[PDB]
Scaffold this active site. Structure first.
Site, PDB file in Angstrom:
ATOM      1  N   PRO A  27       0.799  -1.236   0.000  1.00  0.00           N
ATOM      2  CA  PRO A  27       0.000   0.000   0.000  1.00  0.00           C
ATOM      3  C   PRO A  27       0.832   1.287   0.000  1.00  0.00           C
ATOM      4  O   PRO A  27       1.953   1.288   0.502  1.00  0.00           O
ATOM      5  CB  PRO A  27      -0.808  -0.103   1.299  1.00  0.00           C
ATOM      6  CG  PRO A  27      -0.925  -1.566   1.557  1.00  0.00           C
ATOM      7  CD  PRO A  27       0.338  -2.188   1.032  1.00  0.00           C
ATOM      8  N   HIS A  56       1.161  -6.353   1.789  1.00  0.00           N
ATOM      9  CA  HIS A  56       1.881  -5.789   2.932  1.00  0.00           C
ATOM     10  C   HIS A  56       0.973  -4.947   3.828  1.00  0.00           C
ATOM     11  O   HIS A  56      -0.058  -4.435   3.388  1.00  0.00           O
ATOM     12  CB  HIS A  56       3.012  -4.874   2.453  1.00  0.00           C
ATOM     13  CG  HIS A  56       4.141  -5.580   1.763  1.00  0.00           C
ATOM     14  ND1 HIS A  56       4.079  -6.897   1.362  1.00  0.00           N
ATOM     15  CD2 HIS A  56       5.357  -5.129   1.376  1.00  0.00           C
ATOM     16  CE1 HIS A  56       5.214  -7.231   0.777  1.00  0.00           C
ATOM     17  NE2 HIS A  56       6.007  -6.175   0.769  1.00  0.00           N
ATOM     18  N   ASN A 139       7.151  -8.938   6.120  1.00  0.00           N
ATOM     19  CA  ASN A 139       7.933  -8.946   4.886  1.00  0.00           C
ATOM     20  C   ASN A 139       9.392  -8.533   5.071  1.00  0.00           C
ATOM     21  O   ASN A 139       9.683  -7.583   5.796  1.00  0.00           O
ATOM     22  CB  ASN A 139       7.296  -8.015   3.860  1.00  0.00           C
ATOM     23  CG  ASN A 139       8.017  -8.046   2.534  1.00  0.00           C
ATOM     24  OD1 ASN A 139       7.986  -9.051   1.817  1.00  0.00           O
ATOM     25  ND2 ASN A 139       8.687  -6.948   2.201  1.00  0.00           N
ATOM     26  N   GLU A 140      10.294  -9.255   4.401  1.00  0.00           N
ATOM     27  CA  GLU A 140      11.722  -8.928   4.360  1.00  0.00           C
ATOM     28  C   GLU A 140      12.278  -8.451   5.706  1.00  0.00           C
ATOM     29  O   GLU A 140      12.677  -7.297   5.842  1.00  0.00           O
ATOM     30  CB  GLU A 140      11.990  -7.884   3.271  1.00  0.00           C
ATOM     31  CG  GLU A 140      11.713  -8.401   1.868  1.00  0.00           C
ATOM     32  CD  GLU A 140      12.049  -7.396   0.784  1.00  0.00           C
ATOM     33  OE1 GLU A 140      12.294  -6.209   1.095  1.00  0.00           O
ATOM     34  OE2 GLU A 140      12.055  -7.798  -0.395  1.00  0.00           O
ATOM     35  N   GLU A 257       8.277 -13.291  -4.344  1.00  0.00           N
ATOM     36  CA  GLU A 257       8.629 -12.094  -5.130  1.00  0.00           C
ATOM     37  C   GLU A 257       9.678 -12.466  -6.187  1.00  0.00           C
ATOM     38  O   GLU A 257      10.844 -12.067  -6.104  1.00  0.00           O
ATOM     39  CB  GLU A 257       9.135 -10.962  -4.236  1.00  0.00           C
ATOM     40  CG  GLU A 257       8.053 -10.334  -3.380  1.00  0.00           C
ATOM     41  CD  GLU A 257       8.475  -9.030  -2.728  1.00  0.00           C
ATOM     42  OE1 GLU A 257       9.282  -8.290  -3.330  1.00  0.00           O
ATOM     43  OE2 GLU A 257       7.982  -8.744  -1.614  1.00  0.00           O
ATOM     44  N   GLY A 263      12.727  -3.497  -7.638  1.00  0.00           N
ATOM     45  CA  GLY A 263      12.319  -2.098  -7.764  1.00  0.00           C
ATOM     46  C   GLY A 263      11.116  -1.912  -8.672  1.00  0.00           C
ATOM     47  O   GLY A 263      11.259  -1.550  -9.839  1.00  0.00           O
ATOM     48  N   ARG A 442       1.777   5.235 -27.442  1.00  0.00           N
ATOM     49  CA  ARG A 442       2.905   5.914 -28.094  1.00  0.00           C
ATOM     50  C   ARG A 442       2.532   6.421 -29.483  1.00  0.00           C
ATOM     51  O   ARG A 442       2.807   7.570 -29.831  1.00  0.00           O
ATOM     52  CB  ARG A 442       4.147   5.005 -28.180  1.00  0.00           C
ATOM     53  CG  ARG A 442       5.135   5.190 -27.024  1.00  0.00           C
ATOM     54  CD  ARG A 442       5.219   4.003 -26.070  1.00  0.00           C
ATOM     55  NE  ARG A 442       6.474   3.258 -26.243  1.00  0.00           N
ATOM     56  CZ  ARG A 442       6.680   2.264 -27.110  1.00  0.00           C
ATOM     57  NH1 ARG A 442       5.719   1.843 -27.917  1.00  0.00           N
ATOM     58  NH2 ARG A 442       7.873   1.678 -27.170  1.00  0.00           N
TER      59      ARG A 442
END
Ligand SMILES: *[C@@H]1O[C@H](CO)[C@@H](O[C@@H]2O[C@H](CO)[C@@H](O[C@@H]3O[C@H](CO[C@H]4O[C@H](CO)[C@@H](O)[C@H](O)[C@@H]4O)[C@@H](O)[C@H](O[C@H]4O[C@H](CO)[C@@H](O)[C@H](O)[C@@H]4O[C@H]4O[C@H](CO)[C@@H](O)[C@H](O)[C@@H]4O)[C@@H]3O)[C@H](O)[C@H]2NC(C)=O)[C@H](O)[C@H]1NC(C)=O
Ligand SMILES: *[C@@H]1O[C@H](CO)[C@@H](O)[C@H](O)[C@H]1NC(C)=O
Ligand SMILES: *[C@@H]1O[C@H](CO)[C@@H](O)[C@H](O)[C@H]1NC(C)=O
Ligand SMILES: [Cl-]
Length: 594
Positions: A27, A56, A139-140, A257, A263, A442
């Site tokens: 979020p 999360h 998480n992590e 993940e 990223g 595009r």
């Protein structure tokens, strides 16, 4: 040199589990209109092609000794409404109540929060349903993202035992795993390795017994732009786990993940289109073919349910492309389905048994660690509303590199298709030239606030190019010689005719988008067979004379209706249409008034 793809449909080797049907995000924003739309798109993947949404900070949706669960209720109901499960990370401070997991009383309070929330949703949704949920640790843990919470090594272990005992007290049937991190070589990843050591060899904070429950082990390993790198890293870690912690030899491993690149918000042109889509399929094919076809790898999740931000509607790691249209009255939001999301629908057509297949070039056999590969599957029929099927999914993918100025000549030789009634085949094809909404955007000059007509052009590129069903040659053999692009996806669907026609569309709803536009969302939970050409959508203004909405063939359980006339007020109904032009029963009509 040309690629030769051989498939033998007479030869069912072993199960093909749909282990990839997961997504996630970080979020309230989770209850915004944008998010409700997003989750409609995620859920609309046909045949439950996406099952879980790993989310999360779910325990920041709880406030405070009693808890207000309203916002968590809201979010979990929203998932339920789209037939989605939470990847339930036990993550948050309950609006700042929890600050220290070496404070013994907080550890006890956490245990009770967890049993309290688990009981609440067992009550709201039933034990059978909540027993499917993958409850997970914060998480992590080794990335130090607890904001105001103090989580030491010992604190984490205390926290885990509270999670475990909390869920246990609600019901033994509930599933808990972790740590959800990288497991880098020690001394790195101390909390992650520490959890395994604790569960395997440590002491339960509450009961004092030796070792603690750990139903699955979740890791994160990303590819740094390499598809095969993901699998390679997993095998290294899984082997270390198996050998150093032998109790976990059959403990299911999740990579929840498993993304091409770390990223999510970093803009990448290849994330916009079929490059990302084809690579996702390639990653999955590598795992099926080079691992599962042995450590107990059980789940792969692409963490791509995030909403995109301006100026990167298409280029972020997202299933949808968001357009916040601020020049309308009122401002409104539009989502487009990106090829990666469309590809999940193609993957969803894969059936329960893997078929023998072989890719070769100039006589050299190429495994899935190459730019062209295949997943072939078959379905054993059950009832009179079912029949034999095969699904063959061919990818052409050079990971993150698109090659628009290249063709890939392929020869598909399928054989061993058993005799059946009304055997037909349908091809669905996906590439950047024909099936890229980003490509159309595009070509339009990348308008910041696209007009209604611009959105229609963009949405016309969402679905794969589908060829009308053709009768299969006798002898159960078929040779196709497509000119594939790089990237591209090609699914050949071979279907025998089920005796009875398709089932009924259910859960139809009409959601407003803006003046003269709405989203029709529905479920395919009772339609039955996968041999579907499209869903016929019909609209009635004149009391109840119904007119079909002409559109590209699509099995996506969602459609944005934006007629040139702006005439949307009336009633809608939808039905399945199979490859033999037979309809299923219509849904109940749904009224809509602007
Ligand atoms: C139509 O109207 C809506 C308003 O309703 C408006 O939406 C807003 O858009 C902007 C982006 O254009 C959004 O702002 C962005 O938010 C994200 C996420 O913010 C959260 O997370 C960060 C930390 O991760 C927190 O700091 C923050 O408090 C939030 O919790 C940010 O990631 C964005 O920051 C980048 O862009 C900024 C410029 O927009 C830069 O100044 C900033 O340095 C960041 O750039 C860096 O990161 C980028 C990552 O992609 C990278 O590409 C860059 O190179 C660089 O490294 C930004 O703050 C805002 O949230 C939206 N608001 C709402 C309510 O949704 C639309 O913009 C508007 N449409 C138009 C055309 O105007
Ligand atoms: C719980 O929180 C919601 C949203 O903030 C609020 O509307 C509601 O009044 C709260 N419920 C209780 C029982 O306090
Ligand atoms: C994939 O191919 C590369 C050569 O490009 C090789 O180095 C690597 O070991 C291969 N990995 C697997 C798992 O086959
Ligand atoms: Cl990625």
């Amino acid at each position: 040199a040309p690629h030769l793809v051989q498939v033998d449909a007479a030869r069912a080797l072993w199960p093909l589990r749909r282990f990839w049907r997961s997504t996630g995000f970080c979020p309230p924003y989770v209850l915004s209109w944008d998010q409700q739309l997003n989750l409609a798109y995620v859920g609309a993947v046909p045949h439950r092609g996406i099952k879980q949404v790993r989310t999360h900070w779910l325990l920041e949706l709880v406030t405070t000794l009693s808890y207000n669960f309203t916002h968590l209720d809201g979010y979990l109901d929203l998932l339920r409404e789209n037939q989605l499960l939470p990847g339930f990370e036990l993550m948050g401070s309950a609006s700042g109540h929890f600050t220290d997991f070496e404070d013994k009383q907080q550890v006890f309070e956490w245990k009770d929060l967890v049993s309290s929330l688990a009981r609440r949703y067992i009550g709201r949704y039933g034990l059978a349903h909540v027993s499917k949920w993958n409850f997970e640790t914060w998480n992590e843990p080794d990335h130090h993202d607890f904001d105001n919470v103090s989580m030491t090594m010992q604190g984490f272990l205390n926290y885990y035992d509270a999670c475990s005992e909390g869920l246990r007290a609600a019901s033994p049937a509930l599933r808990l795993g972790g740590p959800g991190d990288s497991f880098h070589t020690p001394p790195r990843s101390p909390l992650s390795w520490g959890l395994l050591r604790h569960c395997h060899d440590g002491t339960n904070f509450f009961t004092g017994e030796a070792g603690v429950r750990l139903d699955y082990i979740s890791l994160h390993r990303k590819g740094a732009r390499s598809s095969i790198s993901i699998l390679e890293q997993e095998k290294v870690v899984a082997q270390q786990i198996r050998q150093l912690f032998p109790k976990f030899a059959d403990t299911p491993i999740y990579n929840d993940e498993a993304d091409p690149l770390v990223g999510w918000s970093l803009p990448q042109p290849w994330r916009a289109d079929v490059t990302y889509a084809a690579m996702v399929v390639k990653v999955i094919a590598q795992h099926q073919n080079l691992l599962l076809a042995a450590f107990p790898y059980a789940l792969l999740s692409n963490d791509n349910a995030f909403l995109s931000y301006h100026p990167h509607p298409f280029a972020q790691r997202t299933l949808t492309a968001r357009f916040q249209v601020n020049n309308t009255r009122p401002p409104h939001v539009q989502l487009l389905r990106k090829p990666v999301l469309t590809a999940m629908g193609l993957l969803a057509l894969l059936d329960e048994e893997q078929l023998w297949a072989e890719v070769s070039q100039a006589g050299t056999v190429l495994d899935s660690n190459h730019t062209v590969g295949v997943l072939a599957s078959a379905h054993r029929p059950q009832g009179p509303a079912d029949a034999w099927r095969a699904a063959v999914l061919i990818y052409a993918s050079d990971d993150t590199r698109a090659h628009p100025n290249r063709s890939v000549a392929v020869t598909l030789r399928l054989r061993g298709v058993p005799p059946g009634p009304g055997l037909v085949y349908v091809t669905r094809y996906l590439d950047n030239g024909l099936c890229s909404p980003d490509g159309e955007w595009r070509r339009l000059g990348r308008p910041v606030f696209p007009t209604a007509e611009q959105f229609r052009r963009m949405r016309a590129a969402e679905d794969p190019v589908a060829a009308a069903p053709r009768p299969l040659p006798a002898g159960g053999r078929l040779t196709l010689r497509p000119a594939l692009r790089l990237p591209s996806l090609l699914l050949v669907h071979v279907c025998a005719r089920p005796e009875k026609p398709p089932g009924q569309v259910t859960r139809l709803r009409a959601l407003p988008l803006t003046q003269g536009q709405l989203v029709l969302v529905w479920s395919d939970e009772h339609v039955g067979s996968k041999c579907l050409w499209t869903y016929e959508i019909q609209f009635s203004q004149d009391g109840k004379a119904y007119t079909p909405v002409s559109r590209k063939p699509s099995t996506f359980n969602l459609f944005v209706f934006s007629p040139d006339t702006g005439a949307v007020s009336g009633s809608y109904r939808v039905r399945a249409l199979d490859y033999w032009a037979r309809p299923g029963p219509f849904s109940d009509p749904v009224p809509y008034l602007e």
